[PDB]
Amino acid sequence: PASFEKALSELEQIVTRLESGDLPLEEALNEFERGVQLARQGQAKLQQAEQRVQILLSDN
Amino acid sequence: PASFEKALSELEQIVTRLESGDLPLEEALNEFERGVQLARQGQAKLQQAEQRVQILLS
Amino acid sequence: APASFEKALSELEQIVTRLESGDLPLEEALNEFERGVQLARQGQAKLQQAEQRVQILLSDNED
Amino acid sequence: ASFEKALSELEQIVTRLESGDLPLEEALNEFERGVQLARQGQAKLQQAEQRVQILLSDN
Amino acid sequence: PASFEKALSELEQIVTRLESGDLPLEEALNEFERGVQLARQGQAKLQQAEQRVQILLSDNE
Amino acid sequence: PASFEKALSELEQIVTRLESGDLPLEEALNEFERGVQLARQGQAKLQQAEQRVQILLSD
Amino acid sequence: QQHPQLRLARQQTMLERLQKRMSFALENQLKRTGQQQQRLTQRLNQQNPQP
Amino acid sequence: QQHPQLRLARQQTMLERLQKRMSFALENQLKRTGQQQQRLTQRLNQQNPQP
């Protein structure tokens, strides 16, 4: 349900922690999961959004 | 929309906020829908009137 | 029925003097012009109708 | 050019321009030549009347 | 100099072949770059001429 | 002088030959380093193009 | 002499100018976020735990 | 009365319509290459020899 802006904000702080170089391997797998789950959600949002403008901006 | 004079005024304000870099998409795509909606309707009136002014050529 | 020629023309002259001021909003100008040309057609036909009455009557023999 | 030559030339531009069968750039350059002639013709009248003024002024 | 009338015909077809798209990207970049220059020049001529007529059409000489 | 369509066509032949998994490992590395060269060579074109039209189209 | 055709025509040209503003405005904003989200996903795939 | 101001405005309207059309054609053109490039690149990075 998360809106676009809240999604990109949460991804930011996940990557900073994963990139710290300091993390137990067990939690790194829970980090990577929630991570790609956010990015894939976001990627279709822009394709969802651009579809609107292509439909809206086209005369038909 | 309002009278045609303000219809232009409304479109000016919209392009003010879209220009200003601060906006999230989910309340920008709706706006851009409203901006074109306002503009496309405006085009319809002016096109319709010009045909009727053929009466000058009647 | 349409008003008399003289009353039709007086209405028209008020419209023209209002457009000539050149300060109406565009919608009023278009709305005013459309009814302006409507009145002129009434007057032109009415005046053309009177010239036909004189012509048919003017013949020495009423023909 | 004289007054009669100018009006005769100006009368042609109005006639052809009235027909309207002209290229856009031709119409613009033809119309603008008309205003040159009109100002040239008008100057003739003001100079003609100003010559009559000096003759008929008793002094 | 190119008259107003012809520029439209030139602009008209360049829009057509682009809308087809069969041309590669490198040619498209060059071509659309020239097409816009036609629009820029044509647009300026009209603006330059209209301000010339309005002064003449006014009471000014 | 690698125009854009030359790179894309060249790249597609390379990828398809990899996925069959028929190569000796030594040349799978030889033709994987060529794969990524063309990926960045192609991308530099669009970055070149998009930055270009923006200055051309923008005032 | 008082027909409104001249004033009508300016409005159509004036309106067009505004539509081009909207499209180049919005089109450019979408690409900004289309590219911003690509950088973060690029960094994420650099940090996968496979190695 | 025979001034050309009417026809000039119509020309301005006509020219703007043309740029909107062609500037849109190329803007859709570049995207078609945007997808094809990024489609083959993803297939390439899915074929790593490191595993």
- Separation of first and last alpha carbons in chain D: 32
Q: Which two tokens stand for residue H44?
A: 């390439």
Annotated resolution, angstroms:
3.8
How far is the alpha carbon of H26 from chain D, nearest alpha carbon, in Å? Answer: 31
* CB-CB contact of A38 with A10 (8 Å): yes
State phi, psi for H19 to the nearest 5 degrees: -65, -40
Which residue type does E39 have?
A
Q: Which two tokens stand for residue A40?
A: 């894939």
Nearest to G13 among H5, H9, H27 (CB): H9
- Whether E57 and chain H come into contact, CB under 8 Å, resolves to yes
CA distance E58 to E60: 5
Distances in Å between the Cα of G28 and the Cα atoms of B18, G23, G25, H35 are: 11, 8, 5, 18
- Whether B46 and chain G come into contact, CB under 8 Å, resolves to yes
H43 contacts in chain F (CB < 8 Å): 15
Distances in Å between the Cα of G39 and the Cα atoms of A8, A18, D7, G33 are: 12, 16, 75, 10
D39 contacts in chain E (CB < 8 Å): 61
Chains B and G form CB pairs within 8 A to the count of 51
Nearest to A50 among G23, G30, G47 (CB): G30
Which structural technique was applied?
cryo-EM
CA distance F5 to H43: 18
* CB-CB contact of H49 with F32 (8 Å): yes
Q: Which two tokens stand for residue B12?
A: 């000016």
Nearest-10 crossing angle of helices A4-18, G5-46: 30
* CB-CB contact of H27 with E54 (8 Å): no
